[PDB]
Amino acid sequence: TVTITDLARENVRNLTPYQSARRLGGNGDVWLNANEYPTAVEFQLTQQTLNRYPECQPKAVIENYAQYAGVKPEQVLVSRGADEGIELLIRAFCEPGKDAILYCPPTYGMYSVSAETIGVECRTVPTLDNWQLDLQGISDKLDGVKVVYVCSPNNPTGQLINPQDFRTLLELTRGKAIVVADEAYIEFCPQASLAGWLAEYPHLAILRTLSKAFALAGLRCGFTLANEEVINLLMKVIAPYPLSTPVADIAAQALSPQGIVAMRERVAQIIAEREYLIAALKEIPCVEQVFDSETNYILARFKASSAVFKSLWDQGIILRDQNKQPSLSGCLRITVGTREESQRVIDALRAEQV
């Protein structure tokens, strides 16, 4: 007898689905584990046309985002979060069982998840001690690689990749692979974006999202910025109707001029709050080292991190354990929320210090 499981693909049977879930409904009061904006921003529907299919790429959304990002509308693609953007790039440039992707741990886990699920080889070149790119290492492992993912600022470490090294990487991949800069957190450091580099690099793609700074993770709305050639190719592999009407509706509102002003105020808010938490964390006894951040989360190495993580978890303070990530032994990622939430963490951590 053959079981349904035997009919499934081998890679599908062996893979471990992404570990994002870690809920405790009604148990945790403070959520600082998903890099979400701490407060809800309300939006109501304005288009009551739900009986009709939406546009494959809602015009209002594409133009409003292109205006905001400073690029041409033909250089923008909108999808179900930056997660889908990650999938699309692999789906269009990587031949299963032949080509490979390359990323540098410790970083965002979906690059690997998508590739492994799709059936594409994952090539890894860990970043250096300061988490900057190991350029020499990358140059020696580009064979068969079609897509390179580099998160900047990086998750979960928080720092920006030296643009000078991005220049090098883009030169190493010229005519060989697509370089994808994941800018899911660029809103917190807009001046460090590579969006203006499109004219110089035909193989440069950029991932963006409304989940983080825009405080609309609930919409599952993201974008890919790239030259026409690339965008047109991705459009050939995307689902016919990737964005729902209600999402296109509120997303377009969120991208209006006033929406951008609000977003920027949310950023200033988070940055100011981050610098507070960072200053306070360095003084706490159980805190060994706090790493610089250009995002809405802070990575810190603790003394007995598993114990600390568990302690705060039992107290309703939900953080994000990084202990199992390469080079991040003893580290926990703390999302920046409100002043009250930061104070909860601070006090709680001071209650440790053993």
Ligand X SMILES: *[C@H](N[C@H](COP(=O)(O)O)Cc1c[nH]cn1)c1c(COP(=O)(O)O)cnc(C)c1O
Nearer to ligand X, 217 or 350 (CB): 217
Quick check: 119 binds its own copies (CB under 8 A)?
yes
Cα–Cα distance, 226 to 232 (Å, whole number): 9
Query: 320 contacts which partner out of its own copies, ligand X, none, CB within 5 to 8 A by kind?
Result: ligand X
Cis amide leading into 163 (omega within 30): no
Cα–Cα distance, 353 to 322 (Å, whole number): 20
Quick check: 156 binds ligand X (CB under 6 A)?
yes
Contacts of residue 111, defined as CB under 8 A and 6 or more positions apart, other chains included, come to: 86, 101, 103, 122, 149
Among residues 250, 225, 268, which one has the least CA distance to residue 70? 225
Helix spans in the chain (H): 4-7, 10-14, 59-69, 81-93, 110-118, 135-139, 163-173, 228-235, 245-254, 257-281, 305-314, 339-350
Nearer to its own copies, 199 or 354 (CB): 199
Nearer to ligand X, 175 or 240 (CB): 240
Instruction: Identify residue 227 by its one-letter amino acid code.
Output: N
Q: Given the rule CB under 8 A, which of 127-135, 163-171, 208-216, 317-325 is the region that contacts its own copies?
A: 208-216
Query: 52 contacts which partner out of its own copies, ligand X, none, CB within 5 to 8 A by kind?
Result: its own copies
Query: 41 contacts which partner out of its own copies, ligand X, none, CB within 5 to 8 A by kind?
Result: its own copies
Cα–Cα distance, 293 to 280 (Å, whole number): 14
CB 159 within 8 A of CB 188: no
> Nearest residue by C-beta to ligand X?
81
Quick check: 182 binds ligand X (CB under 6 A)?
yes
Cα–Cα distance, 81 to 79 (Å, whole number): 6
Q: Given the rule CB under 8 A, which of 51-59, 60-68, 126-134, 278-286 is the region that contacts its own copies?
A: 51-59
Fill in the per-residue mask, 281 to 310: x = in contact with ligand X (CB under 6 A), - = not in contact: ------------------------------
Fill in the per-residue mask, 242 to 281: x = in contact with ligand X (CB under 6 A), - = not in contact: ----------------------------------------
Nearer to its own copies, 11 or 311 (CB): 11
Cα–Cα distance, 342 to 334 (Å, whole number): 9
Quick check: 349 binds its own copies (CB under 8 A)?
no
Candidates 139, 168, 244, 256: give the one binding its own copies (CB under 8 A).
244
Quick check: 192 binds ligand X (CB under 6 A)?
no
Cα–Cα distance, 102 to 312 (Å, whole number): 35
Nearer to its own copies, 2 or 354 (CB): 2
Query: Where does 112-188 show beta strands of DSSP type E?
Result: 121-124, 145-151, 178-182
Phi and psi torsions of 46, nearest 5°: -125, -15
Candidates 74, 171, 200, 229: give the one binding its own copies (CB under 8 A).
229
Candidates 184, 213, 243, 248: give the one binding ligand X (CB under 6 A).
184
What residues from 307 to 346 belong to the interface with its own copies (CB under 8 A)? none
How many Cα atoms occupy the beta-carbon half-sphere of 53 within 13 Å? Answer: 6
Q: Which residues bind ligand X (CB under 6 A)?
A: 18, 20, 34-35, 81-83, 108, 110, 151, 155-156, 182, 184, 209, 211, 217, 222, 240-241, 320
